[PDB]
Amino acid sequence: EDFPPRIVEHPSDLIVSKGEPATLNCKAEGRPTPTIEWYKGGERVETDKDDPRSHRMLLPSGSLFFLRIVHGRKSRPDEGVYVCVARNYLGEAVSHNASLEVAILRDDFRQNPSDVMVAVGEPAVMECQPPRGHPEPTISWKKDGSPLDDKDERITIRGGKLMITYTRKSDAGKYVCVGTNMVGERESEVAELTVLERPSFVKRPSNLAVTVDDSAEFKCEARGDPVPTVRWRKDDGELPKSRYEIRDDHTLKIRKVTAGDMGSYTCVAENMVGKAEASATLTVQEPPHFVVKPRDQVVALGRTVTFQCEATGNPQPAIFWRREGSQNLLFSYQPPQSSSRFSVSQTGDLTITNVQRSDVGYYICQTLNVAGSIITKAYLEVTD
């Protein structure tokens, strides 16, 4: 008794790389043994059973076996879908079609990741598209040759993008996009991420007051990435010809300081990412000068006298009074100890009210600051 031929096992679709071996899944039974015929949509295919010189092999189990896939620029007949057919003494059989496409992966990337230059805390985005390949390559990233993961909340690898919400100095490095499939791995062109820092001050110039022909030093020190260029400037005008120097540490030194050196001097730290400035004032000290000097006076007993004494100077000088041959100092802001008939105004004058005979004498006005001291006096004569 003879049974009609029919396909028992159906072959499934599979992809194989160039040169790599591939095997199908075809099986049929009948009486006598059915010969499995392989044809690429009508066209005949060479096998080991038909000719002993052919490269393509034919297994007696039923499934077709290939050693090396024929593909190139001149000849490529191996690629294409094939269906096995069984034939016995009586009856015909046809199996389901299975895809037998050759797998490939190109050399150059459709989109190479680009270099990014950002300041600390600013986001960083890198984009990539792997080379043309079947099956379509899946993206992954590498930082300094080491694989990168989504684990860190700041880094998200979705689609063809690598995202960093805010950068840390630790984010700097050489980034490479990687395209992988069954064929292999493809690394992209190096995309370097540089995390820069704006300039800021390590030391800020401080306010200074000096006397004429002294020296003035203003200190400055900055940080940053790239290392900044520290430069001095005088705001009202220029730095003094033949009289200044900037030391290696960035100190500003003005020798033999004159009145025309009084003002604001700025220190400027600059790099590619930004600029930062810090100012400080120079106060040139001047000794005091009498504006109004007291005049000798004659006053009737019981009446009020006022000896005027006003002084200019930088800084504004302290004025005080005292009677010749006495230690009791009379100030404006201070309550007068001995008598309340004596008082110094906010501007320096000395008012004596209800003058008595013991008030006779010299009243000394003294003005002083850090740059000098000046002293003057006027006589009080008390008459009947």
Residue numbers in the entry: 64 to 447
Q: What sentences appear in the manuscript?
A:
Roundabout (Robo) receptors provide an essential repulsive cue in neuronal development following Slit ligand binding. The Drosophila and vertebrate Robo1-3 are most similar, containing five immunoglobulin (Ig) and three fibronectin (Fn) domains in their extracellular region. Here we present the crystal structure of Robo1 Ig1-4 and Robo1 Ig5, together with a negative stain electron microscopy reconstruction of the Robo1 ectodomain. These results show how the Robo1 ectodomain is arranged as compact dimers, mainly mediated by the central Ig domains, which can further interact in a “back-to-back” fashion to generate a tetrameric assembly.
The Robo1 Ig1-4 domains are arranged in an extended conformation, ∼170 Å in length, with essentially no polypeptide linker between any of the four domains. Although these diffracted to a higher resolution, the Ig1 domain was disordered. Otherwise the structures are identical, apart from the βC-βD loop region of Ig4, which is better resolved in the higher-resolution dataset. Nevertheless, four crystallographic contact interfaces are observed. The first results in a dimeric arrangement between 2-fold symmetric molecules along the b axis, and is primarily mediated by the Ig4 domain. This interface, which spans residues 378–394 and 429–436, has the largest buried surface (663 Å2 of each molecule's surface area), and is predominantly hydrophobic in nature.
